[PDB]
Amino acid sequence: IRGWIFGTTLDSKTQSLLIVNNATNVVIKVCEFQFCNDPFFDHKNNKSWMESEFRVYSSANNCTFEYVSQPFLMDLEGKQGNFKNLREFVFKNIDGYF
């Protein structure tokens, strides 16, 4: 799970918001994005190549906000065999404030 898409039209008719983590950055951005119907990324466990695609939007017109950071979602320390992590998020959009 790299992130989320949010909005009211999802197709550059209105504004909409993009959250993603790629192979280095975390990025949050808000534009009239013409998103893809099947937005996704390829790795297949990095078996013979690493990250080399961005299939999420075909265009981004007048982006009114953007922010970026170092890679979020740290992995658990030390490991154990088939041990796993619960990641947990609440999103609210109230008083003009996500």
Ligand X SMILES: *[C@@H]1O[C@H](CO)[C@@H](O)[C@H](O)[C@H]1NC(C)=O
| Burial class (CB within 10 angstroms; exposed 0-12, middle 13-18, buried 19+) of 87 | exposed
Q: Is 15 in the site for another protein (CB under 8 A)?
A: yes
Q: Please choose which of ligand X, another protein, none residue 13 contacts, taking the beta carbon within 5 to 8 angstroms, the exact cut-off set by kind.
A: another protein
Q: Please choose which of another protein, ligand X, none residue 14 contacts, taking the beta carbon within 5 to 8 angstroms, the exact cut-off set by kind.
A: another protein
Rounded to whole angstroms, how far apart are CA atoms 81 and 98? Answer: 38
User: Least Å distance between CB 77 and ligand X?
Assistant: 24
Count of CB atoms situated within 10 Å of the CB of 22: 14
Q: Please choose which of another protein, ligand X, none residue 24 contacts, taking the beta carbon within 5 to 8 angstroms, the exact cut-off set by kind.
A: ligand X
Which position among 7, 10, 22, 28 is part of the footprint of ligand X (CB under 6 A)?
A: 22
Q: Which two tokens stand for residue 2?
A: 């790299």
